[PDB]
Amino acid sequence: KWQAVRAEYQRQRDPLHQFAEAQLQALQDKIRANPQNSEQWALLGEYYLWQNDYSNSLLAYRQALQLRGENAELYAALATVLYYQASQHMTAQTRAMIDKALALDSNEITALMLLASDAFMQANYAQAIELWQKVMDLNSPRINRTQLVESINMAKLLQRRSDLEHHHHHH
Amino acid sequence: KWQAVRAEYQRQRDPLHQFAEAQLQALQDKIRANPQNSEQWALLGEYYLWQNDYSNSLLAYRQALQLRGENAELYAALATVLYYQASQHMTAQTRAMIDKALALDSNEITALMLLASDAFMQANYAQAIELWQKVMDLNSPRINRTQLVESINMAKLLQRRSDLEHHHHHH
CATH class of the missing domain: 1.25.40.10 (Tetratricopeptide repeat domain)
Structure with missing residues (x-):
């Protein structure tokens, strides 16, 4: 070493991937507790995306976006789900979610x-x-x-x- | 009125039916320009379906699917072409494209x-x-x-x- 291993911190989906309990009643219970919260549905979308449950991810993200209105991070997350759902191939739905994202935040x-x-x-x-x-x-x-x-x-x-x-x- | 005419927006094939030029070298030229693009062949399949040219639609969609691999939207589009080709009667080919679609996206x-x-x-x-x-x-x-x-x-x-x-x- 020197020490020289190169210092480095987290990111914004490495923190978000703080999965790997594992049954999360938690996220659902907290939604039943409070249903009009945008970021709560987004977190559900995130969980399902990690499980690669694209259908359920899309449903959760859709609800998040219904509640919040147009929002770049949620447009980008939808696009992520659509893209992965299409086996990492671009798609008209995917490109439009990306174009909407970038119109709110370049x-x-x-x-x-x-x-x-x-x-x-x-x-x-x-x-x-x-x-x-x-x-x-x-x-x-x-x-x-x-x-x-x-x-x-x-x-x-x-x-x-x-x-x-x-x-x-x-x- | 009230106003009360009931507000309403588009869909996902009403937007797609942004037919009704009309000769579209455009779609073909863009395929000759770039031939490995999945969604470009799907758009060709879509054009032909609108023209009710089921044979040519099937060819274009088949190519789209060759390139993309299994994909629910394309399985569903194939099934739509097959169903209409059979005068809106179910068919073994049709049901299998539907079953494949729903296996990728319930x-x-x-x-x-x-x-x-x-x-x-x-x-x-x-x-x-x-x-x-x-x-x-x-x-x-x-x-x-x-x-x-x-x-x-x-x-x-x-x-x-x-x-x-x-x-x-x-x-």
Whole structure:
């Protein structure tokens, strides 16, 4: 060491993934106790998303959003559920939830990170890079910065290989 | 008025029916531009379905599904094409696409609405009602709720008439 292990803290879904009890009457009971609370339904949506119960996640998030009105974080969460439900393939429903999110908050990271990753999967590396750089530029405690650097360097490597295989060296 | 005309918004196939140009090189050109995109082939399938070109619709949707892998919305769309191709009669191909849809998403409304309507046409009103109620219970912006109420009341009327004609008053 030096010490040099590199200091690092949590994020905003690593904290949110404070699952791994496990039967949570808790979250439901607290909803029966108080039913008009936005963030309580969002937490239910979050639990179901972790369980990969996309149908039930969508229902809970939908209710959250009914109560709160238009809200970027909830638009981005819906988009996350839809995207995963479609096996991590973009979808018209997914893109519209993302577009609604970004209209309320141009720097909503959850939405930006879904867009980046999907650009990468569709080989639009230049868009992926641009988006991961936009996020990096936010200096946010939310995303591990070494992850962004690494994702960008992979997109760069894959761009070059594409350029080389297609003899497409310009842009 | 009051004003009392009753406020109401779109759905998810009323927006999708943003047909009624009309020659759409557009959709084809965009496929030639990018051929590995799932939702682009689905949109082609959707165009052809609107034209009632069931053969071409099936081809486009099949390709969409080849690319995306199992996906409830596309299973439900296939089932819609097959059902309409068979003049709105259930079919083994149709039921299997519906069963695949509902295995990926137990609340896929397109599949639920085909099942309900077909139950109605086969005089299984109790099943139709149960399905239309399940949809209603989803509190979804997708289906006009007054339509579900009306469809359920018709099934109720037709049930009673059947009970009366057959002297079958129990269930």
